[PDB]
Design a protein around this ligand. Structure first.
Ligand SMILES: OC[C@H]1O[C@@H](O[C@H]2[C@H](O)[C@@H](O)[C@@H](O)O[C@@H]2CO)[C@H](O)[C@@H](O)[C@H]1O
Ligand SMILES: OC[C@H]1O[C@@H](O[C@H]2[C@H](O)[C@@H](O)[C@@H](O)O[C@@H]2CO)[C@H](O)[C@@H](O)[C@H]1O
Ligand SMILES: [Ca+2]
Ligand SMILES: [Ca+2]
Ligand SMILES: [Mn+2]
Ligand SMILES: [Mn+2]
Lengths: 239, 239
């Protein structure tokens, strides 16, 4: 059985097990800031940042025809300090081609180049979208399962607890091909769940990079924070 | 689209919207005790209790072939006061034939007569099993999805936060036929998730009773508490 597994109770500058891209930064206090925060403490607009695990993970194998089961957990907080305009854009957990660089920002969240449904993206993501683009449902924020497109195949509205930490658990069972994600707000006790069928074998390449990406709006002050406090990942490829 | 929906922030004695069977009792303080508790505050062994919603719900319809989507949420606490013998047996959220009476106790949790997988049982349950019977995996407690049998088709171990309150969310999506359940322990922040594919129209009858059932062990002190503090349910049948 081939297994990959990492865990971060917190983050520390320089940890060579993490690849930072764009605005992604690790404060001295241990928190990972995906998008830029000005020195006055306010989140900056027109910002995009991502963090990947330095090592690719074997998600499935052609020869044997088997696919791995995985689980990831992380905590984050989104703070929307401005009244107007509307905050943007959200953050995502994603698995895609190895050696990837940041794509388009804003509504694309740093992982897509446009709103097309294109299988060549070979990307899977679970988004926490805070801005309603023309391809989004009217409700925001919302959890969404993204398969080769920013236009989610499944969506679940949730209420933001401004500035509070949320716990996320994303799990994939190769057996039934079910991807189930859950979001919890310890502060209010709120629990959100979402599940959909995803055939990883038809979406992702055999090896993929796993990471987190966040982005702020395309206009002045259409921004919010995208802070991550911890992150763990585990995958098991049978045989 | 016929919809059924109820919610109990707390329980009140006499409320004719709930059917109590076996040992099930509602205290003056508003908590629902599925299994018996002696006057000295200790849980009694050899006890079985169930609570059914007083009205059947329409889960699917032959005519149209449409099946409903539902969601249920409840809070409970299991307290295992004795060191030995091992505590038993657990509690279940279940849907089954209407006008039913409690079945066998102990490991059968009051909803099955034996461990046989039989379609005539027409019972679906999400269990929180605290005792490992011959048909159970070695780990307890565990969440299990029961389809016409006490021998779960899917199992997920979880760590009991003895005596503390747990929040449960069980959701079923007719579209994908996915049953996803999540258990959360506010006290420790633990989050457990489990999901499996279940085709409700090949398992349950058109109309069903929805309820909660709990049971304590077959020998002295093989007992624990099975208290429920709140419970809500909702189902939507298209057309
Ligand atoms: O306001 C936040 C959103 O901006 C959208 O882009 C807008 C832009 O803000 C506006 O000035 C003008 O250029 O129209 C654009 C729409 O194409 C982003 O697309 C959206 O993701 C948010 O960032
Ligand atoms: O001890 C709790 C478990 O008891 C099991 O039944 C036992 C019984 O306790 C023992 O005295 C003897 O009769 O063997 C039985 C096994 O068949 C229950 O089956 C189990 O559910 C627990 O309640
Ligand atoms: Ca969006
Ligand atoms: Ca058992
Ligand atoms: Mn979206
Ligand atoms: Mn069991």
């Amino acid at each position: 059985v081939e297994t990959i597994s990492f865990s971060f109770s917190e983050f520390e500058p320089g940890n060579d097990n993490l690849t930072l891209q764009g605005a992604a930064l690790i404060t001295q206090s241990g928190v990972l800031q995906l998008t830029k925060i000005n020195q006055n403490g306010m989140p900056a607009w027109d910002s995009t940042g991502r963090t990947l695990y330095a090592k690719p993970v074997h998600i499935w194998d052609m020869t044997t025809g088997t696919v791995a089961s995985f689980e990831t957990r992380f905590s984050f907080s989104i703070e929307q300090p401005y009244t107007r305009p509307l905050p943007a854009d959200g953050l995502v957990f994603f698995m895609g081609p190895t050696k990837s660089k940041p794509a388009q920002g804003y509504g694309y969240l740093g992982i897509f180049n446009n709103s097309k449904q294109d299988n060549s993206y070979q990307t899977l993501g679970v988004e926490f979208d805070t801005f309603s683009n023309p391809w989004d449902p009217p409700q925001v924020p919302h959890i969404g399962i993204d398969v080769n497109s920013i236009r989610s195949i499944k969506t679940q509205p949730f209420q933001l607890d401004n500035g509070q930490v949320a716990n996320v658990v994303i799990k994939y069972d190769a057996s039934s091909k079910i991807l189930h994600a859950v979001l919890v707000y310890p502060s209010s006790g709120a629990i959100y769940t979402i599940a959909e069928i995803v055939d990883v074998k038809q979406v992702l390449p055999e090896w993929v990079d796993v990471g987190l990406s966040g982005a702020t709006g395309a206009q002045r002050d259409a921004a919010e924070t995208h802070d991550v406090y911890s992150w763990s990942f585990q995958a098991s490829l049978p045989e």
